[PDB]
Every structure is written in structure tokens, then in C-alpha cells.
Amino acid sequence: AFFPTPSGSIVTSESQLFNKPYWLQRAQGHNNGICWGNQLFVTVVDTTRSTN
Amino acid sequence: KVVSTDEYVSRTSIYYYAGSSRLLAVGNPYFSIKSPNNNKKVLVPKVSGLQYRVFRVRLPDPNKFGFPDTSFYNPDTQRLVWACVGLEIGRGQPLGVGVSGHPYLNKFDDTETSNRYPAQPGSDNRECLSMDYKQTQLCLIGCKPPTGEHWGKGVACNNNAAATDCPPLELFNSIIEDGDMVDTGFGCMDFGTLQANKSDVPIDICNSTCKYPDYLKMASEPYGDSLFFFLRREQMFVRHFFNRAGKLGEAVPDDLYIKGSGNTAVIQSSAFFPTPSGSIVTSESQLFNKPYWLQRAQGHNNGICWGNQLFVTVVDTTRSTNMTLCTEVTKEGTYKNDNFKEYVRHVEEYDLQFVFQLCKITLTAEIMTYIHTMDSNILEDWQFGLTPPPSASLQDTYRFVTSQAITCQKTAPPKEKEDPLNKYTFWEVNLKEKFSADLDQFPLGRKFLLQSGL
Amino acid sequence: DPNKFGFPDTSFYNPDTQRLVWACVGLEIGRGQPLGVGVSGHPYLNKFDDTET
Amino acid sequence: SNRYPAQPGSDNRECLSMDYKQTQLCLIGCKPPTGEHWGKGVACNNNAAATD
């Protein structure tokens, strides 16, 4: 019964995903950004700002 | 109500280059060495590739210039100010990263392949080790020196609680003076107060306050006089895994692990820490020896440098090589160990070029309000809105100053106290007597004319 | 030297009040070997101990 | 790690193996292609060659 270990790699600012603009001219679904109920739901997951 | 900076100045049709000399900087990359007999007598200053190199130019005043053509400038109402349009950071050293490391590092074990029970106790297990740092390259420009936060101490509060004993935490934004340390992957925090063992971090950091550029606060500044234009590029990854050596106060809760016995009756540490290291450092992803034609700033100040001065900050670890000196004491014919005294030195090389464009400001009375609510100090250096000083006649006149009609005469007030920024050690560069008007005699004005589309 | 060239045509070149010079416009570096890194080493290098782990 | 006194021995040959470089090339010709290699030749047998 075996299991390996995950180990990560290097992390650059060149291939980041934050502090950059976004414009939603056309979404994928049918709601084009119309937020019902006067609320939003944003979720973000990072692991690269996680010093101890 | 704020406004942008393209509606009350005007670009002229004249351009100026100025350029510094080649900067020299040498020292020891581990500690400053003072006198044994005195504290303030430095011998070799501590400079490495890990210091926030902060230069501050002093561009000469425009209104002290006398032109043969006095047509474009009105001295009755208009004034001048300088603007930055082109800029250069020069580097002249071979590429290579240096190593640092504390000789008494708080490494208990290594925790990556095998740590066999039982633990190895003993009240002293610090040892010597060394490692690479997180490589970093970035640059900032502005007319106000850049701000920086850090993590620090503080009061928790009053003793209503009787829960535990753990230190508090609080951020503090400060002014980034020169000589301060760059982060390398161990928290933007002061190790001089938050740590007590002084035996976990290499020696360059342990009595420092390593800070980090707050991009968020500077962008959220109203006038925007602290971020003209900036880049950054950095990377890191892991090297090993170690663990601390001490009683972990915040112990592991009981339900989340099955207790052992016999050889497995004691619990080891649960505080781990990795060691960072840079990757390959190419010459392709360099950030300097390249022109920067500023077109439009992200703030509102579009290059107008109030106060006739600029601030450049730059950090680089890719030229952090370490020269190892080796001299002897007694000449032998056979090898010895006590016959050599060694030293370690680190060099540093910089250069700066600048392209300036002067600008006139029509001064009507509604605009100088907007200058006044910017800050009051700009308007007085132009000597524009002042008061007539009253108080005509005095009689403090005596023919003989050392006599017996004494009034105990005292003079020399401290009235030339004007600079609030004098509490921070910058790197001054004298640029007042280094101008010229012929751009085509320089290795950057030739690059300027090809970019201008003339 | 360019001035030692007796040209068959003289109608483009006055030797009394002109001279000639050369200039590079083409440039090439030729290699002819397999690729490989060399290694050297001191037989008495000043290594005291290890300091990695 | 070569912390050392001298080491004796008559033969110290061992069993080793390693890979080589990956290398892709192709070429088309009218004449069959010509290459080169280094090799031994004349020695000119003169001037006190104390090195073989």
C-alpha cells in the first residue's frame, strides 16, 4: 500500500492571477452579470502568500 | 475635489538630459564594524545586495536660469516645474548570487525523509548552516519616498483576560529609509523585538526591520505623488524542511492524534519551517539597462516632480557576489592553518540617467488654492504669496560690544531648520552642476531621438 | 588598404581630393564542434566542512 | 566529500551506466554527407619530446 508526496514547484510573478484588470463584456451563461437579490459571491483561493 | 495634472501645466518644446557619474559602493555584507573605542566611529559600513538602495536626487531650480529668449516665460505670473519623461538604471557587474547564514541556527532535526523515534534531547543543539535567499528585482520612482509596512509588537490590552501568554501583533506603515533589509520569505516583520532567541534567522536580519512595498496604500493615495511607474519580478521555491527546538506553548489538541507509548510516549516538535532558495537567474529576465519612456502614470501626477527632487529605489540580488579575501601573516614553505587571516567583501555598482522636460504654469488665483491644499511648502519656495513684515524701528545699537552696559547678547537662532526629512539617511546625489542642452552627445539622447519619431 | 586598388574605372573616384575607407555590413561567427561543458578543479581546495544540512 | 589520506589499490574499476544527450537532426543531399573526427597522425620525431 503506497502513497506519494506532493511537493510544489517554483512560483513566479509572471504567471500570477491577481492585481490585474478584468472586463466582463460577455459571460458564458445567460445571466450577463445581473446579480439578483442585491448580493454577489466571489471566491478566491491562493497558496502562494502563505509564509509561516 | 482632485483633478488630473494635464489641465494646468503645459509641455514646452525644449528638452534636457542630465547624468550622474559612476557610483562606487563597497563594504561587508554581514555586519557594520564600529570602533572598539567608540560607538559612532564606523570602519566599514554594512552593505550587501540585500539593502533597499534608496537614492534621492536634487534637481536644480528652474527659475534660477537666464535664457536669451525671455518670451515663453512670464516672470510676473508664470513659474516653472520639472518633469521626468525618460530614465535609466545602469548595472556594470557580472551576475551571481551570494549566500548568508547564521552560525547558531535553531535546527532541531530534518523532517523530510526520516526522523526515527525517540527524540534526541539536550539543552543545546544550535549549529551553523547557510542558505540562498529569495531573489527579487523591482524599482519605484516618485517625488515622495515610498512607504512601507512591517509587522510589529503592541499592547494586547488590559488584563481582563487570563487565557494564555502569547505576544500580540500589529502592522505599522513607516518610511523606507536606506539600509533597511529586503524580505526573503520570513514575514514582513521586526525580528529585533518579536524574536528573543536571535538564533533562527541569518545575522543580516535579526536586528533589522525588514519591510515591503505597500502597492495598495500608494495606489489608494488621493493625489498620487508616491507611485509614478514600477515593475517587479521575483521567484522562489523550497530547499529542505527543518523544525524548531523548544517547548511549543500552543500544544497539539488531544483529539486530533492517537497517543503512543513505550518508545512513542513523548511528543516531538510540531513547529516546522522551510528554507528558501532562488532558481536559475538568467540575463534574459533582467529589468535594467533598458530605457523607460514614461507616457502616462497610473496616478494623477504625470511626472511633475514638486520640490525639484526625485526618489528612486531599486533592489537586486542577482549581483550579490561575495569576494573572499585571503592574506597571510608569516611566510612558510609548508602549509599551515593558523597562517592565514581571511576577510569577506562585497561590491556594488550603479549608474543613473535622466531625461527632463521643463514646463510653465499659468498662475491665476483659483489654481494656487489647489497648490495650497496640495501642501503649503511649494508656494513659498517660489516666494509668491507672502506678508509684508511690520515692525520698523528698533534701537539695539551700542558702540562698544564688550563693556559694562551689558545686555548679555545672544544671537544665531536655529531658524534654518526647514527639512522634516532629515531624520532618515538617504543617498544624496549632487545633480545641480551637471546639465547640458545638446542631447546628441550621449548614449541615451541618441536613443531618445529614435524614439521621439523626429 | 583601399588606396592601393588600381580601378578600371576612374569616373567615380577622384584621387586628388578624396580617399576611401571600409565599413562592416555583414557579420557571422562560425562554430564546428559538438556541444559540451568543461569541468576543472583544485586538488587542494579550501573546504573545511559541509554546511548544507 | 574527499576527506583524504592517499588511497592504494591495483584496480578500482566499477559498474556504472548513464544516458546521453537527446539530439535530433536531419539533412538531405545529392552527395552522401561528409563528417569529421579527431585522430592520431604523424609525430615528426624530433626536438627531444620528453612527453608522450
Swiss-Prot record, chain D:
It is found in: Virion; Host nucleus. Transmembrane segments: none annotated. Belongs to the papillomaviridae L1 protein family. Self-assembles into homopentamers. The capsid has an icosahedral symmetry and consists of 72 capsomers, with each capsomer being a pentamer of L1. Interacts with the minor capsid protein L2; this interaction is necessary for viral genome encapsidation. Interacts with protein E2; this interaction enhances E2-dependent replication and transcription activation. Forms an icosahedral capsid with a T=7 symmetry and a 50 nm diameter. The capsid is composed of 72 pentamers linked to each other by disulfide bonds and associated with L2 proteins. Binds to heparan sulfate proteoglycans on cell surface of basal layer keratinocytes to provide initial virion attachment. This binding mediates a conformational change in the virus capsid that facilitates efficient infection. The virion enters the host cell via endocytosis. During virus trafficking, L1 protein dissociates from the viral DNA and the genomic DNA is released to the host nucleus. This is Major capsid protein L1. It comes from Human papillomavirus 58. The gene is L1. The chain holds residues 159 to 210 of 524 of the full protein.
